[PDB]
């Protein structure tokens, strides 16, 4: 316990049917939000309190709209409560589910590719657009201290030169998840894969999501080619160069996100610097 | 030579009063019979349509297509196109550099915008290049049995790619269809010409890219570099489609070779080597 325990009980009893009590409340990991697992008599619930500083990062009204909008696709787990004023959301917790990792993900291509095809060709108009260069400027002005990363102004300029390349290649605007870390995929006992945690989801080019999938799980070149044969279709075209560019933009943006989050109280060790350095490496190989 | 005579006869109407034919030599070439006529002030390519090629190429469409493609300024000047005589006469670019599989690798910045120009031309060429239909076409034209080993099984494998292409999406654009490096000619004034449009037809642009890569044996790094010059919002690129079209080209042109050899040509090992590269491609693709 206890006051956090009290709040969590104070906030999920309205979901508890006649004759039901909370057995235990456990803290979970997580990067964006303050997460808990509430175990009850009948079932378990994921409780997510909006993380430190995230109000500037995520439009929570947009997120709520997007959760409702995407429900019929059946990709995510259920949301039981989404209460913006209280700063809380409660999701279904899938029992005996397996959370994917960078190793186990390599065995699930035939399940992941159709999930991504589903969202990318859904025609869903999400509230909010992910404009990568605008996002960089966003994190720049949110960060109070100077950005700690070496040679930033020059790296930033090299990164911004990619905007013209993207415009020349053509940028698509489709519903995207935006954050394809392997832990966002869970497999239930029946063998059904779910894609969870849509809080960053926004309109973007689908090559962003492919880049994220590949980067976050460190796909090999062969693995990328094999995944792409699962994914590529008339309705889901693939540009390899766009993927390479979005990998650089992602490392750039999330390294900045890390600086912001760490000013808001977090500590992610070397997460931020490692991503930044990978962006620099990506730039050198690209250019 | 009676050859001398008919050549003089044909380009006669192009020459003036004391303008004369200095010499005539035989050129290389795989589809037609080609000759260089050197005259007082101009040099001309004289092309006699190859034996049996009327079955392969619609010459009336080719003439039409020539006219339609003129305002793009890609080809050299055509002076004569006589279907009845079975002859065309083009300008021969003096002291031009004919590109080869080596020199083509230094010309990406000139080639990519040529291919962008044709592929985004919005022009409706007469003739559609449907590769699986083209395979069936060659099979019907070939009189003896196709000599290639295990052909039925290989053909089966090749035809299994029709459905893959349909699932990837097939575009329909004006294409050159025959991008051997020798079809690129560099003038001493600096411009690159793309010549010999006789196979040009509506097709997926990934076919032209596959032909360019395959005929000059691009390395994968060279392909990637080339695609950096070519890829754009208007000219999107699919790596898998390029790989499939390479297999299709090797198959089709191996059959073209059997057909041509039945007309009396001898291309040495060209046919079997292309067929076997399709076999190799199919193995590497699966
Ligand atoms: C959003 N990050 C990519 C920074 C990790 C969160 O899943
Ligand atoms: C048409 N081939 C590809 C067989 C060679 C002619 O350029």
Numbering used by the authors:
A (entry chain A): -2 to 284
B (entry chain B): -1 to 284
Paper text:
Afterwards, the choline kinase LicA phosphorylates choline in the cytoplasm to form phosphocholine, which is further activated into CDP-choline by the phosphocholine cytidylyl transferase LicC. Therefore, the choline kinase LicA is crucial due to its role in initiating phosphorylcholine metabolism pathway. Here we determined the crystal structures of apo-form LicA at 1.94 Å (apo-LicA) and two complex forms with choline (LicA-choline) and AMP/MES (LicA-AMP-MES) at 2.01 Å and 1.45 Å, respectively. The structure of LicA adopts a protein kinase-like fold which comprises of an N-terminal domain (residues 1–92) and a C-terminal domain (residues 93–283).
In the complex structure of LicA-choline, a molecule of choline is located at the active site of the C-terminal domain, whereas in the complex structure of LicA-AMP-MES, an AMP molecule and an MES molecule occupy the active site. In the LicA-choline structure, four aromatic residues, Tyr197, Trp251, Trp254 and Tyr268 together with Val178 form a hydrophobic pocket to accommodate the quaternary amine moiety of choline. Glu213 at the rim of the pocket makes a charge charge interaction with the positively charged quaternary amine of choline. In addition, residues Thr29 (mediated by a water molecule) and Asp176 form two hydrogen bonds with the hydroxyl moiety of choline. Superposition of the LicA-choline complex structure against the apo-LicA structure revealed an RMSD of 0.4 Å over 278 Cα atoms indicating slight conformational changes of the overall structure. However, drastic differences were found in the active site. Upon the binding of the substrate choline, Thr29 forms a water-mediated hydrogen bond with choline, resulting in a shift of the P-loop about 4 Å towards the choline molecule. The residue Asn30 in the P-loop also moves to the active site and makes a hydrogen bond with Glu196 to further stabilize the P-loop. Therefore, the active-site pocket undergoes a change from an open to a closed conformation upon choline binding. In addition, mutation of the choline-binding residue Thr29 to alanine decreased the relative activity to about 10% of the wild-type.
